[PDB]
């Protein structure tokens, strides 16, 4: 079985798992919609009461399973809870990352295609001295709409450009070239290059954005809006719903990806300090880097109220239309846009390999496929299924809700219950702390066993016909994966 080569490479690979497209596209929108600073306090609390303990739990479950040759949750749940229903629940740890990848790699290809076009200067050229922002936003809006082929009429049909489709082919090929080299020579080797690159690009963009100023505002105004606490909105449950959901999304928790990565950590190697360092690096890249780019740039040009209204228009609109349009009003702004989309591409690529590895690990561990065949069959499934996302409008929305939103939160609660309630709280705690360079504070034993599951349960309770096409297909994917698990059990 493969193993990570270096402790640093393991850290950077896990950091790249978490630091992805959602950290930079979705997190600023969610922070701005919920009052900025009024969102950061619950998010930080959700980082301490949900993100940190669930990260340690997934690290421990992964290393525990990998010790017996199993990297995915159908087998790992059954090891922790010897029950046929544990295998059925474990299927979600393959279905969630696969379905997410079926649209995630497509969005990743957007950022690559935009990086190419912005580097060569093939971008919309708004007329100078524009006294109206719409005359600048509209060329970039039509630019994205032509790239992905937004429907012009009532038919929910997307029409991707030829360039967008070719770039999606290249993007799949790049993911395959990394994954086919394996854990150490592929994912780990790429992480050691991509994470320093990602960090340097983000720091540069933060500095450049921080210098932005118009008569409508400054970047410091946006930072003040994002970091000034508002204790009145602590009463609102919706802020906690958004904060805990963002904790799942930014940390790649509940996607089965952390577990599979941790399955290549050796039996004796640390997971406490290593996991804490990976999660801390991700939060630095999320709240400090990602949150300090697009929202402060928007506030600098539009003011807080208009920037919030812009953020309500969605992650795609802010990331692919509004931010490049704002950049186009500055010297060297086309090159600044290229850096933004190159940052997004490396963040996406380090995350998409992470959510495609669970299916690869299942085929290797349980069906005994070679790495080459496992990676190629996984890529074929993702590439084929992605045509539903590329051509059917709102198919991505349905996949992102059922697998990317409902699925990840329920799966995080499920894995915690299996590990800390069914398998055994004391046994789980000793397995988490075994071989650690530092020990988890004893207070977290009662956070994992009582506070975290009660937190998730309470918040979950407080929480067109074409949609059935996507539902019918992802339900079929689940049935397909259940059949593969069935075939594995008949061979074992
Ligand atoms: C399972 C259904 C198979 C359908 C194969 C569709 C392959 C995509 O087809 C391509 O898509 C592009 C637009 O997106 C066009 O630019 C190309 O001309 C077209 O060949
Ligand atoms: C692996 C991905 C589905 C999630 C990742 N944390 C991101 O920000 O994109
Ligand atoms: Na990433």
CATH number at residue 388: 1.10.4160
Residue 445 belongs to a domain:
yes
| Cβ neighbours around 172 below 10 Å, total | 21
Bridging pattern class, strands 217-218 and 213-214: antiparallel
**Residues contacting 275, CB < 8 A, separation 6+:** 14, 55, 56, 59, 262
d(CA 159, CA 305): 34
Cβ–Cβ < 8 Å for 385, 477: yes
Binding site membership of 331 for ligand 1 (Cβ less than 6 Å) = no
Kindly state the tokens that stand for 421.
């309630």
Residue nearest to atom 4 of ligand 1 (CA): 387
Segments forming the whole domain that contains residue 204:
7-463
Q: What are phi and psi of 155, to 5 degrees?
A: -75, 130
Kindly state the tokens that stand for 378.
């996984």
Residue from 297, 276, 114 nearest 216 by CA = 297
Exposed / middle / buried, residue 409 (Cβ in 10 Å: 0-12, 13-18, 19+): buried
Residue 358 belongs to a domain:
yes
Whole-number Å distance, alpha carbon 161 to ligand 1 midpoint, is: 10
Tell me, what DSSP letter sits at residue 218?
E
**Residues contacting 411, CB < 8 A, separation 6+:** 92, 93, 96, 254, 255, 256
Binding site membership of 252 for ligand 2 (Cβ less than 6 Å) = yes
Binding site membership of 103 for ligand 2 (Cβ less than 6 Å) = no
Q: What are phi and psi of 225, to 5 degrees?
A: -65, -35
Residue from 256, 246, 247, 257 nearest 351 by CA = 257
d(CA 112, CA 119): 10
Residue 453 belongs to a domain:
yes
**Quick one: which atom of ligand 1 is closest to the CA of 160?**
14
Binding site membership of 52 for ligand 2 (Cβ less than 6 Å) = no
Residue 362 belongs to a domain:
yes
Summarize the annotated binding site for phosphocholine as residue ranges: 84
**Quick one: which atom of ligand 1 is closest to the CA of 164?**
14
Residue from 205, 236, 270, 241 nearest 14 by CA = 270
Residue 485 belongs to a domain:
no
Residue from 19, 416, 24, 59 nearest 270 by CA = 59
H/E segment holding residue 490: helix 467-491
d(CA 492, CA 487): 9
User: Ligand 1 test: best mutation among 162, 382, 473, most atoms within 8 Å of CB?
Assistant: 162
CA–CA distance from 465 to each of 156, 397, 470 (Å)?
10, 14, 10
Q: List 218's β-bridge partners, or say none.
A: 213
CA–CA distance from 72 to each of 27, 261, 355, 378, 455 (Å)?
28, 10, 12, 14, 26
Rg (CA), the chain: 22
Residue from 422, 455, 459, 7 nearest 241 by CA = 459
Residue 471 belongs to a domain:
no
Cβ–Cβ < 8 Å for 308, 322: no
Q: At CA 256, angle to CA 164 and CA 477, rounded to 5? A: 60
Sign of CA dihedral 54, 58, 60, 64: positive
Residue nearest to atom 9 of ligand 2 (CA): 20
**Quick one: which atom of ligand 2 is closest to the CA of 250?**
6
Q: At CA 307, angle to CA 236 and CA 214, rounded to 5? A: 140
Whole-number Å distance, alpha carbon 13 to ligand 3 midpoint, is: 9
d(CA 145, CA 159): 9
Kindly state the tokens that stand for 184.
């150490």
Residue 261 belongs to a domain:
yes
**Quick one: which atom of ligand 1 is closest to the CA of 162?**
16
The structure was resolved experimentally with: X-ray
Kindly state the tokens that stand for 60.
């421990």
Binding site membership of 337 for ligand 1 (Cβ less than 6 Å) = no
Measured from the alpha carbon of residue 104, the closest ligand is 2
Binding site membership of 100 for ligand 2 (Cβ less than 6 Å) = yes
**Residues contacting 195, CB < 8 A, separation 6+:** 12, 15, 16, 19, 281, 350
Whole-number Å distance, alpha carbon 26 to ligand 2 midpoint, is: 10
Cβ–Cβ < 8 Å for 459, 245: no
User: Ligand 1 test: best mutation among 165, 166, 380, 385, most atoms within 8 Å of CB?
Assistant: 165
CA dihedral 352, 356, 357, 358 (to 10 degrees): 130
| Cβ neighbours around 63 below 10 Å, total | 26
How many alpha carbons lie under 13 Å from residue 264 in its C-beta half-sphere? 27
Residue from 239, 317, 252, 306 nearest 279 by CA = 252
Cβ–Cβ < 8 Å for 289, 343: no
3-state secondary structure of 64: helix
Cβ–Cβ < 8 Å for 109, 102: no
Cβ–Cβ < 8 Å for 257, 14: no
Binding site membership of 387 for ligand 1 (Cβ less than 6 Å) = yes
Kindly state the tokens that stand for 477.
């994917």
H/E segment holding residue 214: strand 213-214
CA–CA distance from 202 to each of 27, 71, 183, 198, 321 (Å)?
15, 32, 26, 6, 19
Binding site membership of 163 for ligand 1 (Cβ less than 6 Å) = no
What is the tally of structural domains in the chain?
A: 1
Q: At CA 387, angle to CA 386 and CA 390, rounded to 5? A: 90
Residue nearest to atom 7 of ligand 2 (CA): 20
Kindly state the tokens that stand for 447.
């956070």
Residue 193 belongs to a domain:
yes
d(CA 281, CA 19): 9
Per DSSP, the residues of 237-290 read HHHHHHHHHHHHHHHTTTSSHHHHHHTTS-TTS--HHHHHHHHHHHHIIIIIIG
């Amino acid at each position: 079985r493969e193993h990570w080569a270096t402790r640093l490479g393991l850290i950077l690979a896990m950091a790249g798992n978490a630091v992805g497209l959602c950290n930079f596209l979705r997190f600023p929108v969610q922070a701005a919609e919920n009052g900025g600073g009024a969102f950061m306090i619950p998010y930080i609390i959700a980082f301490l009461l949900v993100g940190i303990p669930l990260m340690w739990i997934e690290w421990a479950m992964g290393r525990y399973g990998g010790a017996q040759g199993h990297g995915t949750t159908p087998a790992i749940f059954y090891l922790l809870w010897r029950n046929r229903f544990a295998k059925i629940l474990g299927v979600f740890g393959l279905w969630i990352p696969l379905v997410v990848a079926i649209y995630y790699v497509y969005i990743e290809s957007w950022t690559l295609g935009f990086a190419i076009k912005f580097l060569v200067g093939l971008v919309p050229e708004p007329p100078p001295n524009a006294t109206d922002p719409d005359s600048i936003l509209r060329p970039f809006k039509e630019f994205l709409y032509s790239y992905i082929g937004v429907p012009k009429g009532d038919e929910p049909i997307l029409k991707p450009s030829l360039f967008a489709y070719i770039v999606f082919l290249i993007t799949m090929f790049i993911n395959v070239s990394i994954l086919i080299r394996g854990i150490s020579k592929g994912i780990e080797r790429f992480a050691k290059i991509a994470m320093p690159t990602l960090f340097i690009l983000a720091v540069f963009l933060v500095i450049r954005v921080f210098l932005l100023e118009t008569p409508n505002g400054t970047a410091a105004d946006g930072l003040n809006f994002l970091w000034t606490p508002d204790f009145e909105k602590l009463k609102d449950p919706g802020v906690w719903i958004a904060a805990v959901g963002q904790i799942f999304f930014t940390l790649s928790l509940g996607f089965g990806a952390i577990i599979t990565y941790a399955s290549y950590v050796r039996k004796d190697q640390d997971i406490v300090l290593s996991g804490l360092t990976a999660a801390t690096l991700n939060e630095k890249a999320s709240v400090i880097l990602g949150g300090s780019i697009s929202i402060p740039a928007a506030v600098a040009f539009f003011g807080v109220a208009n920037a919030v209204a812009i953020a309500k228009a969605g992650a795609f609109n802010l990331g692919f239309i509004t931010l490049p349009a704002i950049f186009s009003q500055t010297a060297g702004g086309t090159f600044l846009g290229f850096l933004w989309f190159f940052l997004l591409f490396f963040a996406g690529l380090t995350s998409s390999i992470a959510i495609m590895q669970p299916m690869i690990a299942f085929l290797e561990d349980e069906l005994k496929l070679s790495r080459k065949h496992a990676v190629l069959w996984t890529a074929a499934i993702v590439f084929f299924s992605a045509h539903l996302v590329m051509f059917l409008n709102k198919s991505l929305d349905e996949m992102d809700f059922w697998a990317g939103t409902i699925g990840v939160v329920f799966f995080g609660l499920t894995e915690l219950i299996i590990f800390f309630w069914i398998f055994g709280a004391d046994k789980a705690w000793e397995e988490i702390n075994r071989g650690g360079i530092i020990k988890v504070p004893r207070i977290y034993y009662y956070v994992m066993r009582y506070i975290t599951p009660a937190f998730l349960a309470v918040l979950l309770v407080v929480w067109h016909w074409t949609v059935w096409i996507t539902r019918f297909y992802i339900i079929g994917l689940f049935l397909f994966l259940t059949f593969l698990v069935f075939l594995a059990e008949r061979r074992r």
